[PDB]
Amino acid sequence: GSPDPRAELDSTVLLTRSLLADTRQLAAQLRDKFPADGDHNLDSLPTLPAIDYALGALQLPGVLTRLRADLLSYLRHVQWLRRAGGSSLKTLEPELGTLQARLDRLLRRLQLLMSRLALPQPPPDPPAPPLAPPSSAAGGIRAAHAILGGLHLTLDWAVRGLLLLKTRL
């Protein structure tokens, strides 16, 4: 019947938290295997979404639309990573592929949430060209740290924004 937005948000936030946990674990696996010099630029990829720290600005339709766009970008980068990452990354390949599948599940839940709540369809941003292969095996590892680190932050700030937004419904 008629949807309860608080329940729809709850189930969407819960699923987001699970993906956040998966991402946090995989980033830790990678860091444990490549401690290197500590940390590298999360800006090591200019093609990834920027992190939106501005809470209280956007409303629910806008927050959801931008999250959908961000997640689709992360899915593109994860798919790219699994293909051209190199031998160094294939020890993470099962977890990466499961992360990609759960990323798709969250995208579908967001699409369902927007349909159930009658929120106008997000305008499709034109398609970015294919991601070029990393210039080196090290470059692929740096890309993996940036992709997983950025996804974690995106999901963390989405949970925060959706919970503070639900507080007012």
Numbering used by the authors: 10 to 178
Question: What's written in the study?
Answer:
Interleukin (IL-), an IL-6 family cytokine, has pivotal roles in autoimmune diseases, fibrotic complications, and solid cancers. IL-11 activates downstream signalling pathways by binding its two cell surface receptors: the IL-11 specific receptor, IL-11Rα, and the signal-transducing receptor, glycoprotein (gp)13013,26. Following the formation of the receptor complex, the Janus kinase (JAK)/signal transducer and activator of stat (STAT) and extracellular signal regulated kinase (ERK)/mitogen-activated protein kinase (MAPK) pathways are primarily activated. IL-11 and IL-6 utilise a homodimer of gp13026,34,35 while other IL-6 family members exploit a heterodimer of gp130 with a second signal-transducing receptor, such as LIF receptor (LIFR), OSM receptor (OSMR), IL-27R/WSX-1 or IL-12 receptor β−2 subunit (IL-12Rβ2).
